Design a protein around this ligand. Sequence first.
Ligand SMILES: *[C@@H]1O[C@H](CO[C@@H]2O[C@@H](C)[C@@H](O)[C@@H](O)[C@@H]2O)[C@@H](O[C@@H]2O[C@H](CO)[C@@H](O)[C@H](O)[C@H]2NC(C)=O)[C@H](O)[C@H]1NC(C)=O
Ligand SMILES: *[C@@H]1O[C@H](CO)[C@@H](O[C@@H]2O[C@H](CO)[C@@H](O)[C@H](O)[C@H]2NC(C)=O)[C@H](O)[C@H]1NC(C)=O
Ligand SMILES: *[C@@H]1O[C@H](CO)[C@@H](O)[C@H](O)[C@H]1NC(C)=O
Ligand SMILES: *[C@@H]1O[C@H](CO)[C@@H](O)[C@H](O)[C@H]1NC(C)=O
Ligand SMILES: *[C@@H]1O[C@H](CO)[C@@H](O)[C@H](O)[C@H]1NC(C)=O
Lengths: 248, 201, 218, 214
Amino acid sequence: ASVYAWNRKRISNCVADYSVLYNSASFSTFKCYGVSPTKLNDLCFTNVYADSFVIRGDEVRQIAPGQTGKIADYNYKLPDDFTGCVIAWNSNNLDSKVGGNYNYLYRLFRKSNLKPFERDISTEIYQAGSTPCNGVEGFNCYFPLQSYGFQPTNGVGYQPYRVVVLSFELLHAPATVCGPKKSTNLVKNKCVNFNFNGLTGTGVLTESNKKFLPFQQFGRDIADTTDAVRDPQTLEILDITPCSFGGV
Amino acid sequence: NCTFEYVSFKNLREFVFKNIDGYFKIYSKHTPINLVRDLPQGFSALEPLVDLPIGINITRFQTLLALHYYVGYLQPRTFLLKYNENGTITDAVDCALDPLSETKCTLKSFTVEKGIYQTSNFRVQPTESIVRFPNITNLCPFGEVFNATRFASVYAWNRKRISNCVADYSVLYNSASFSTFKCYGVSPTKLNDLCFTNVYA
Amino acid sequence: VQLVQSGPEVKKPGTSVKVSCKASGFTFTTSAVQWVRQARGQRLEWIGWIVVGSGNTNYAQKFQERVTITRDMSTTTAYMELSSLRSEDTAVYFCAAPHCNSTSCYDAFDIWGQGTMVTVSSASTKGPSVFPLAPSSGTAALGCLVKDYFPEPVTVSWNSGALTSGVHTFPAVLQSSGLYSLSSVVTVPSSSLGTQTYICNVNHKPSNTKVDKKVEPK
Amino acid sequence: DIQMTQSPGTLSLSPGERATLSCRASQSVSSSYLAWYQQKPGQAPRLLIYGASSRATGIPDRFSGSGSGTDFTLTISRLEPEDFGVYYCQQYGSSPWTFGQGTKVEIKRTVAAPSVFIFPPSDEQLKSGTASVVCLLNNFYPREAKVQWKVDNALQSGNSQESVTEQDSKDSTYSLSSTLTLSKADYEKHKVYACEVTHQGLSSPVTKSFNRGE
Ligand SMILES: *[C@@H]1O[C@H](CO[C@@H]2O[C@@H](C)[C@@H](O)[C@@H](O)[C@@H]2O)[C@@H](O[C@@H]2O[C@H](CO)[C@@H](O)[C@H](O)[C@H]2NC(C)=O)[C@H](O)[C@H]1NC(C)=O
Ligand SMILES: *[C@@H]1O[C@H](CO)[C@@H](O[C@@H]2O[C@H](CO)[C@@H](O)[C@H](O)[C@H]2NC(C)=O)[C@H](O)[C@H]1NC(C)=O
Ligand SMILES: *[C@@H]1O[C@H](CO)[C@@H](O)[C@H](O)[C@H]1NC(C)=O
Ligand SMILES: *[C@@H]1O[C@H](CO)[C@@H](O)[C@H](O)[C@H]1NC(C)=O
Ligand SMILES: *[C@@H]1O[C@H](CO)[C@@H](O)[C@H](O)[C@H]1NC(C)=O
C-alpha cells in the first residue's frame, strides 16, 4: 500500500523465527528499539501489529522515533517511546516501472503533523491561501497526494523501498503471538527457575486464592516485582514466592 | 473503503473512550442501580474491554437512540488508586481536586493527620515567548563553497570565513547528495535555532 | 525574502536557454512560480506557472511548443527551458512567487525576480562605432552616434559623468542589418563651445569596447 | 482566453492630482483573483493591490481599488513623483493568467515646442561608405511628434528610423532622435539635407537643413 494509506495487519496465535530474517541480506534495514533484535526468540511476544508501506530510499531515515520530514510529519509518525522493529528492503525490481509508477502515492500537504500511528487518506484539496477551495485546483489550491514515479533507472536513493514496522506491547498482558519455544511441565511447591511468557525468575510456584480478572496476567508486590502468574496452559493463578530464604 | 470490522432505571452503564497514539481504548462497567433522578453516588472501577488500532482522528461524536445519558470529558490527571486484598479498586484520590487531595497524594495515604504539611510548589507560568535575533537576513556563500568549480588538495585545505549571513542547514541535511553528514557536540537536526558567532568552512 | 534570476544570455537561433530562479526567505516547498516575458518596449506576456510541491505545469498557448517549466526543491530553484530560440524570443524574463510560511501562502505574486535578458539573432558580436555629431555654427546641441554594435546594450556618459544636465541618451533601434544604433545628445550654451572639451564615453560590455570620442565644433 | 485591456494608454497628470486607471476583462472574473502591479522602466514588477481591494505590504494607503466582474478601477488619491511608471492588471483565476498592455502615468505639463537641430554625418563615418544624418527634437510636449526627411526637396521614406526617450524627470518633456541612413554614393549625389518637424507646440512645421560641405 501507499505510505499515506499504510496498511496494518494484526497477527494472532502464531510462532515466528526472526533469526532467518536478521540473517537475511535481502533486508536493507533491520533496526529494533526497546528490544534487542538478537535476543528475540526468548520473550514470548504479547501484542503484534505489522504495518506496511512503500517509500523511497531518501525517506527511509524518516521511519524512526523523533524524526521529521514529509513521511514522518504527514504520512506516518512513530511515537518517541516506540517499542518494536523497523525492517526495510529495496523493491526496485517489483515496484519500479519504466516511465514512472503511478500506483504509490504520498501525502504532500497537511496543516498539522500526524499523531503517532495516525492514518490520513482524505483527498480534500489543500487550501494554502485564505480563499477557500471548492474542490477545484488552482492558485493556493493543490491536490494533497503526489506520485513517487518509481523507475528502475532511478538512483538507489530514489528507488522504491518496502518498509514493515512491527509494533508490540511486550510482557504487559496475556500473550497470544508467541515464539517457537517448547514448554515444560509445571512443578508446584518447589524452588524452580521459571519463565512465564518471557518473564524470568527464581521462586516457588504455589496455589493461590487471588481472583484474577480475565484480562490480568501478572501480579506485582509493593517493590514492583512479580508476585504471581497465570499459567498460560491451565487458567489458574499461581503465586510466586521467592525460594524461601533468610540470614545465616 | 473499510479497514476494520468486528462482531461479537435499572441498569447503569458507564464507558470511557480515549485515544492514545492512534489506539481507541474502550473501558466500561455495568451495574444495577435504583435511581432515576441523577447518577448514583459511589465508587466502581471500570475494566478494559476494547483496544482498536484505527488511527482515526476523532474530534466529535454522537449517540444513537432507538425510536419507535451523561457526557463528561477526560483530563490528564494523576490519581492514587487503592487496591484491596482481592485486587479490586475500592477508592481513588484525584491529586488535583483540591489541596486536601494534593496532601493525600503527597503522603500516599487516605488519612491525613493533624498538622501542617508542605505539599507542592506554585510557579507562575509564562504568557508569551520572546525570540530575539539581530535583524540581518542575508544569503550565505554556501552555494559557492559546496558547489565550487574546483576544490583544493587536502594538504592545502581551504578555509572560508562565514559571517553576516543567515543560513538554513536543513536544506543540507535533507540532501541525498551528501554521502556523509555527521555532527559532533551539536545535533544535525536542531541546527536552525542556534545562533553562531564564528563559522569556518 | 529574495528571488534571484540568471544572468544575461546571448544565444544563436535554434538553440535553447535555461533561466534559473532561486527563492529565499519563504518556504519554497509550498508555493508556486509563474514566468512572464517582456519584449523591449512591449507589455507583459504570461508564459505559464508551476506548482512547486507537485510539479504540475500550465503553459500559455503561445509558449506550449517551446517552453518547459521545471523545479528542484532540493536546490530551492525553478527553471524555464526555451528551445528553438529566435529573434522574437529576445526579451526580459521574470519569475514570480507568493511567499509562504510552513503552512500558509500569500494570496498573490508579491515576490519577483530581477529579470534575465535573453538576446537571440543571426548577429555576431561587434563593437560599436562612435561618430561625433558636431554642433552647428544662444544654445547649441552636440552628441555621439553609437552605430553598428551587437548585442544590447551600450552605456554613454559625458565628461566621464561630470556632464549630466541636458543629456538625452535615446533608446537604441534595431536596424534591418541586425545591428543597433543609438544617439546621445547634450545641449550646452554656445559660448562654452570654444572653452570646454566635450568627450562622450561609450562602453559596450558584450564586446569589451571602451571608446572616448571628443566632439568638436567645426 | 480572457483578454485584459488597460486604460488610458498615457495618463498625463500633474504631481498631486488624483489618478484613475481602468481594467476591463473580456468575461466576468472573480474579484478575488485580480491584482495590480507597478513596473518602472528597467525594473521588476511590484505588487500593489490584490484581491481587487486588498493593499499589499508596504504599498501606501493612497492606492485604492474597486470594481466587479469585467470592470475594475485603480485610484491614486494624491499622485506622488515616485508613482510615475507603468501599471498592469492581471487576472489569475482562469488559466491562462493573462496580463494587460500597461498604463503609463506621466507628469503632465504645458504644451512645449521642440528645439530642432540637424547633424551631418561625420567624416569618419563617411570614410566607411555610409552617411547618417541626425535630427534632434529637444524638450517638447506632448510626446507626439512628426519628422520628415527631405534631401534636395525630395521627401524620404523607408530609409529613416526614430527613437523617443521617456519623459524627463525634471522638465517633463520628451526628446526625439531621427536618423537618415544613406550610402556614400547617394549621400554624394545630393547637397541639401533637411528635417521638417511638425508638433503641437509649433504653429507651423519647422525645417532645419544643412548644405553638404559648407
Ligand atoms: C502562516 O501565515 C498565515 C497567514 O499569514 C499571512 O500570510 C503570510 C504569508 C504573511 O504575509 C503574514 O504576514 C500574513 O498575515 C497565518 O495564518 C494566520 O494566523 C493568525 C493566528 O492567529 C490568524 O489570526 C490569521 O487569521 C491567519 N490568517 C490566515 C490568512 O490564515 C499562520 O498562522 C502562519 N503560520 C505559521 C506557522 O507561521
Ligand atoms: C484532527 O482534526 C481536528 C479538527 O479539524 C484538527 O484540529 C484543527 O487543526 C487545525 C490546524 O491543523 C486548526 O486550525 C483548527 O483550529 C483545529 N480545530 C480544532 C477543533 O482543534 C486536528 O489537528 C486533527 N489532528 C491532526 C493530528 O491533525
Ligand atoms: C477508497 O480509496 C480509494 C483510494 O485508495 C479512492 O480512490 C476511493 O475514492 C475511496 N472510496 C471512497 C468511497 O472514498
Ligand atoms: C474477597 O473475596 C472473598 C471471596 O468470598 C470474600 O469473602 C472477601 O470478603 C473479599 N474481600 C473483599 C475485601 O471484598
Ligand atoms: C550543485 O548544482 C547542481 C546543478 O548545477 C545541482 O544538481 C546540485 O544538487 C548542486 N549541489 C549542491 C550541494 O548545491
